[PDB]
Symmetry: C3
Subunit: 253 residues, 3 copies
Amino acid sequence: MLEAKFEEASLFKRIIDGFKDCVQLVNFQCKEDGIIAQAVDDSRVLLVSLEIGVEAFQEYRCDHPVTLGMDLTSLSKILRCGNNTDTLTLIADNTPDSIILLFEDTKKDRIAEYSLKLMDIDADFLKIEELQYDSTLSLPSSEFSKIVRDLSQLSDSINIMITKETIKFVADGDIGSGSVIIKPFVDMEHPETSIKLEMDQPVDLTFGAKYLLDIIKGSSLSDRVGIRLSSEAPALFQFDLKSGFLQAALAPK
Amino acid sequence: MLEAKFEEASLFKRIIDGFKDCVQLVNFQCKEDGIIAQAVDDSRVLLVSLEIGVEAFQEYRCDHPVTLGMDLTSLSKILRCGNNTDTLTLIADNTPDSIILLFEDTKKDRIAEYSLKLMDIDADFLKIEELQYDSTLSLPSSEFSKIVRDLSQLSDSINIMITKETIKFVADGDIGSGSVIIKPFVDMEHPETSIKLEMDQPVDLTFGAKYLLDIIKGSSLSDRVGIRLSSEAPALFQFDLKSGFLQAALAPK
Amino acid sequence: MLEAKFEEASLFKRIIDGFKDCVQLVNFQCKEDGIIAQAVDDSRVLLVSLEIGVEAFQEYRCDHPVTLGMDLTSLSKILRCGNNTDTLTLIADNTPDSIILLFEDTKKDRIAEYSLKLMDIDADFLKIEELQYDSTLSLPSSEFSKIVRDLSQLSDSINIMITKETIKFVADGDIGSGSVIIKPFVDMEHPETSIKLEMDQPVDLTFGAKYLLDIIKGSSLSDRVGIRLSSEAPALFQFDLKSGFLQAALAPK
């Protein structure tokens, strides 16, 4: 039986919106260790993954490894149905055909219960990460998101080129071309605005615009974003959070 | 001759928007006692009524019971044409074919006059209210509006079930089902957040989604909303204001 | 070689949006004296003009009178691609086929360079202004813009009638008619809210709605707007700024 209780429902809503437009119909898996999720879009180019630890809740309980597939559009349609200041509780049992979400106010004057009919999803999972990549950077999520949104207006292709102490974003389309160049710096005044880069091998990889625009929707989850790039493996974007992370994998071109 | 003068035009704008999407082409009637209005939509399921007393104005004057039918879309198209900090004055005469609206600033540097061509509306009125119903509740308008908006995403049918110290809102659709349960409580810390219920007979009535979504547009008129429900009579939603009220009547199913 | 450097990019963005929906594909001309621009829409009814002096920049440099035609939609698509707190630098050379825009942050951690492919525009210019008109007024830009937006809902024709100490705006359509009357006053409490009028000959001219709605988009450029009206010459709307101005010319009816 699954009895999870978030401290606040806002976290779960933001997490769902972090890859809502990325992939739909994600098959979560709940264990006694935490909640994970892995999904691939219809085009099979983006691999989105979720990990939520026990510490992200004020009270978590589980006694059966359950697998729960549901529609992200309908799930987000339900997640907006609770007063944001209330507390959210996920409820499921052994071999279920629906998941139940309980919204409770502090003094229990109102109680909202929503039942969501599940979906039959093929239980397939993918593990492709390694310990080190050709280059590894970390930059503020808002800055990276604005960079992507700026370059998406020019073309449907965004190139990233990383050399020693140099990160470059190129985009060439019909109306013209654009280039954003950032350099690593460990600023003492503000550590969060600092861009960090570890350089092992130069990188020059082209990605799509739509997939990055959907990826950057996890900007509300973290202040920073960590990108791992290698010539052989897919680019790895990662947003960290309180005992958990969202991890997108995008194949270059 | 009708010479009404609101203290501020914002009240009239909000009142028009309280049932703007409810019913269009409402035939107001102005007497020396106040301004009332009654309208039915094309489907003839929703009966919307308005009552505005003399105290809602800083200066009211009338000497002839005039009847004035006009388009709510065009009326709202005109009501946005005055500086909100100015004062609004309704002007009409005996047997008129247009109504004149006068917007005046405090120091009279600018004067805006708008003439609205009226509509020929059949003078029909309906009085169906009684003193007591099977159950009578009153709850904050924002809470009720959010409840309706939350349940409208699931289905086009919203059931309300009232039992002793229990108000329940059910909605079952394709993606799933939802239930919001509130209990009466007279909270001392905040009297406005208190939900009040008088129980004479149990109620279990299903209503539409679109009509309730249009009804709840009078949430800007009052902090609370009073709902009267009986098995025989149509459900009565009411928003009170400064010497007046908006009153919608919706037929169950 | 053209090397202009705005104090802030916000000014240039606002200036482009001041006539963005007015005319597209405007052919700027840069001299060692300043930057000017003149454009006519496809209908050839609105003549939009721009003048930007050297003092509008913190650092301007030029050694060749260059002529630069570009698309306003694409230019505005690029102007949103720089962090608003950064500084913008226009770069061009002798006989160019593209213009380069440089966005620089204060500490130079990031540098954004955008290349815009130019357009071949016939170098035609028009000078039609004179020193005096039949009537000349100046009123707050926000007030005038709201007046235009209020009257645009009634009809596609907005008449302006100016007599001694009387400015009137008429608009008669299907649903009705509207009239906004403002009077000149030199208010001591607030000089900016004052409306000023110099009266030499009475004016009664009808203009379009769409063209005025596009003209009033320069409301973000100035607190006030100066209108010059004569029976013979086109109406002249003007927004002033820090060493420069935007000047639209609209033909009456």
